[PDB]
Design a binder for this molecule. Structure first.
Ligand code: HEM
Ligand code: HEM
Ligand code: HEM
Ligand code: HEM
Lengths: 146, 141, 141, 146
């Protein structure tokens, strides 16, 4: 991913304010609510029967933390997303066979969650920079499909 | 296909836009043009600069069209037939672009309506915009 | 969204299918399982071998469902409500798989009915299967 | 793209029967008819107003011949599609900005045309081999997006 120093600065600054314990769960949770077929990949996670059950599910919150951590790992090394995500790509593509459109969906759900949290501060230029990041992450996750 | 709950959620949430229609619509377009620059190709003679009065005017049209869609949510192809002919027949907009604008509309609503943008309402709004998109990208005359 | 002429094309084409509906549904499923092996994960306990009586029996169910949809092309959400709940709520089928089966149905029709499979009929059938797919991937109770 | 010897043999046998003057135009024409937004990329081609107009359009037929030629070349370079299609990828992605889902659609329209022309010869195993090929070609064309 090619971010200008200005774009990287904007992205990094905002991410420093992102709740490590909650935002990943909010994103994963909304993925499961907004695109319900994605629940098929999380049978073992217990109760996903209603929006409240999904968002309150401890395993969703806990798994969300790992997802956010991976986005964080991506931000730490934007010049090597492919290498950073190689093991995750094998998992999501070769093992789980997640259709890669869903990678794009989760990235865009995360963007919605950032907008929800930060309001006016999530300006169109800040969004544009984040779209480069989540597109890069989706592409890296889908690398074993390419 | 929208559930009864989806229709209730959309009517309630979109109903809060009100006189901010032009503002929100314009912001969604600006977000789209900036985040996804290929979309600008459909507007070759527009002023697409930040704060452009032309984008503000176009934002109001898009938002008013969504208001129209809500008021006819059970019979949208007949209500949006003119917009379908424009976008599908005349302009031949690639369907992917509707996903991009729909996402930018969700981002805009999330940024302005934090109390309203619950996971359930988020889901209903996404389905609504996908339905509108399917109508505008279809040729059914 | 289907045009009036689309609906006529679909009714005429599926009518020609007639008594082969079941055979073609089975063939489309076989094509899907072989061409797109990930789709087999939805049928983990099935006998998926070539000539499988179980696949043949499932193909007839799929074809009869399409025949029903053709018969209710103006009212597909109501007509397919049970099937939508099965695929979208219970089975949680990823929408990409509907594009794969729809393609395999078109391939099957093209292989068996080449005279009937004109570009206009091809177009109408593709739209019809997309419309069916949208209903079966929607939760609208 | 890796083909079994049986798949390679079957792909080659079917392709030998393809009318190279017509099939590309049929595939391109049906793309323009079935997915009408794709016509936006061919505004200079003249009359595309009806299915008959599209299918009989001399520019559609001539351009289809080039498209088929690219598929034919790909069949001979299945192990190096990203290399082979590099110039075409730069054209379709960087210059024309064709959304890559359309590459998948054209490949599947080509498969439908093969099924139309060869009927019982286009068996499910033969289709499966061709799906590998057209997925490989679409992926290679989309490489600049990856
Ligand atoms: C697009 C960005 C995504 C990121 C950054 C991401 C990240 C991760 C991470 C870090 C793990 C844990 C890996 C481990 O523990 O070894 C994981 C596991 C998993 N992911 Fe994702 N993921 C993404 C998208 C998706 C999507 C869209 C789906 C399904 C629709 C999905 C389904 C799963 C499943 C089923 C697991 C394993 C859960 C389990 O342990 O039972 N992932 N992902
Ligand atoms: C929810 C989705 C959309 C809605 C509700 C919508 C609504 C509208 C409306 C109301 C108009 C003005 C109609 C008139 O002047 O009579 C319009 C025009 C237009 N739309 Fe959209 N639209 C949508 C998506 C898109 C997308 C995704 C694109 C391309 C990226 C697009 C490209 C255009 C263009 C090029 C015009 C004409 C501008 C001009 O030259 O005057 N639309 N749309
Ligand atoms: C044109 C689109 C489709 C139609 C018309 C259709 C129709 C049907 C019908 C009629 C049934 C039998 C329901 C019953 O009698 O209980 C069924 C079951 C099922 N469908 Fe589909 N279907 C479609 C697409 C798909 C796709 C794309 C998938 C997955 C790739 C899928 C996965 C299943 C499964 C797993 C079952 C249950 C099989 C079992 O365990 O008994 N369907 N479908
Ligand atoms: C997926 C397989 C495809 C193949 C193998 C293919 C192949 C080709 C080839 C060989 C050319 C000529 C390049 C040259 O003259 O230098 C070309 C040009 C072009 N392609 Fe494709 N293409 C594919 C998909 C698409 C799609 C889906 C579109 C969508 C509209 C598209 C739009 C174009 C356009 C606009 C041109 C230039 C036409 C002109 O000269 O005015 N291509 N393609």
């Amino acid at each position: 991913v090619h971010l200008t120093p200005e774009e990287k600065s904007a992205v990094t600054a905002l991410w420093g304010k992102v709740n490590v314990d909650e935002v990943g769960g909010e994103a994963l949770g909304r993925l499961l609510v907004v695109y319900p077929w994605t629940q098929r990949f999380f049978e073992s996670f217990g109760d996903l029967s209603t929006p409240d059950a999904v968002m309150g599910n401890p395993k969703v919150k806990a798994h969300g933390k790992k997802v956010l951590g991976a986005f964080s790992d991506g931000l730490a090394h934007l010049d090597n997303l492919k290498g950073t995500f190689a093991t995750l790509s094998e998992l999501h593509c070769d093992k789980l066979h997640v259709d890669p459109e869903n990678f794009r969906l989760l990235g865009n759900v995360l963007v919605c969650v950032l907008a929800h949290h930060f309001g006016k501060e999530f300006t169109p230029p800040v969004q544009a920079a984040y779209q480069k990041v989540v597109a890069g992450v989706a592409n890296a996750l889908a690398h074993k499909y390419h | 296909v929208l559930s009864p709950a989806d229709k209730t959620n959309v009517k309630a949430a979109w109903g809060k836009v009100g006189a901010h229609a032009g503002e929100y619509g314009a912001e969604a377009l600006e977000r789209m043009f900036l985040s996804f620059p290929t979309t600008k190709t459909y507007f070759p003679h527009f002023d697409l600069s930040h704060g452009s009065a032309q984008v503000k005017g176009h934002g109001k049209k898009v938002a008013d069209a969504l208001t129209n869609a809500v008021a006819h949510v059970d019979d949208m192809p007949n209500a949006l037939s003119a917009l379908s002919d424009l976008h599908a027949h005349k302009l031949r907009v690639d369907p992917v672009n509707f996903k991009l604008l729909s996402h930018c509309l969700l981002v805009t609503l999330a940024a302005h309506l934090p109390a309203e943008f619950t996971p359930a309402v988020h889901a209903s709004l996404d389905k609504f915009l996908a339905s509108v998109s399917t109508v505008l990208t279809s040729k059914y005359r």
